[PDB]
Design a protein around this ligand. Sequence first.
Ligand SMILES: COc1cc2nccc(Oc3ccc(NC(=O)c4c(-c5ccncc5)n(C)n(-c5ccccc5)c4=O)nc3)c2cc1OC
Length: 256
Amino acid sequence: YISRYLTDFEPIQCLGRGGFGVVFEAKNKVDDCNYAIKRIRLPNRELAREKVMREVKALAKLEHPGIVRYFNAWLEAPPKVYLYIQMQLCRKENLKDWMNGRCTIEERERSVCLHIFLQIAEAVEFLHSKGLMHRNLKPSNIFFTMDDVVKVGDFGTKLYMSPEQIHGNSYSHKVDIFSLGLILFELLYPFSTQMERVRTLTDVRNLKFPPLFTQKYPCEYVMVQDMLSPSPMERPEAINIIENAVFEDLDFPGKT
Ligand SMILES: COc1cc2nccc(Oc3ccc(NC(=O)c4c(-c5ccncc5)n(C)n(-c5ccccc5)c4=O)nc3)c2cc1OC
């Protein structure tokens, strides 16, 4: 049996593993570039397989500076069945890592945080304009290119999902706005411990804010409140978030 993956690529390292499968770094022999290759074992459930095959087709249609860049997808059935997805190789550190490495307020300068957030929001508004939604927006699903442009993806815990999703109710694109609210807060508010992070984010979910955040960031405090509305209908659209005066003339020393 001839494996397309082993024929066309030189494996470099395993980048990570999940319930779906594995992500490798591998060099394409012909074009000499390094890629991230996600390998999915096709599920035994036929409706889950339907979802996988449909989502790869959807991914292939997507082109945006804030969405991980797609190259190829193929199936292999060795002597059960694997779907390989080839995408642009990003940096090791995702947004969760980035925040974990910047644990002081000095390391979360307003304009820097707003610049990162704006890119995420622009990626989400792109999805919403295409009649798509993310559903699983969280810092660990936010990646950086080698040039630090933020890339929204989905590697595949409940702290970022909308209340309607948690309860297993029907939902709309407004679920992504809820996740955006928590991400904006988390970018602006550094933590020293996981325990502090969990306690504070849980409070913020219920619209209980740390007093120093409300004082230092009145404008983003207002927009986080709006994005975290229990009622999905009263959450703003992503296009309304991106047009907020808060994102007007963002600049910081070292910005491209
Ligand atoms: C150095 O370290 C790393 C560099 C990495 N570089 C690049 C990518 C990396 O990981 C990723 C990131 C993203 C994805 N997939 C998606 O974003 C997918 C997307 C999607 C894209 C954009 N938005 C939402 C979802 N979907 C629709 N499909 C889909 C889902 C179900 C079935 C079929 C296809 C997706 O696979 N895969 C691997 C890395 C991980 C690294 O360390 C672990």
